[PDB]
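ERR on first pass: missing label on line 2. Operator R.T. fixed the label and resubmitted. Corrected input:
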Amino acid sequence: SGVLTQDTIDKLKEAEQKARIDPYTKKIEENTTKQKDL
Amino acid sequence: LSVNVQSIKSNVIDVDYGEAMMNLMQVQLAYQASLKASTTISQLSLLNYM
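pass 2 clean. output:
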């Protein structure tokens, strides 16, 4: 599959991203939640 | 921290399919031809018995 496997690996690149930014985002929504309602 | 180690784990143990299979192929190239060569070698041998 060549490039496709590499691109599949690129789509896993994003998997670490969502794995990473979600924890960031999980406390951003509390940052935003308890900022907005403030 | 777990993710860090998991990444490090993968870095150490897990193979690249393309690089490995590609290198599987490069060896298989010489290997497979040698197989056909082996047949041909025998075929030449069997030739001189008129």
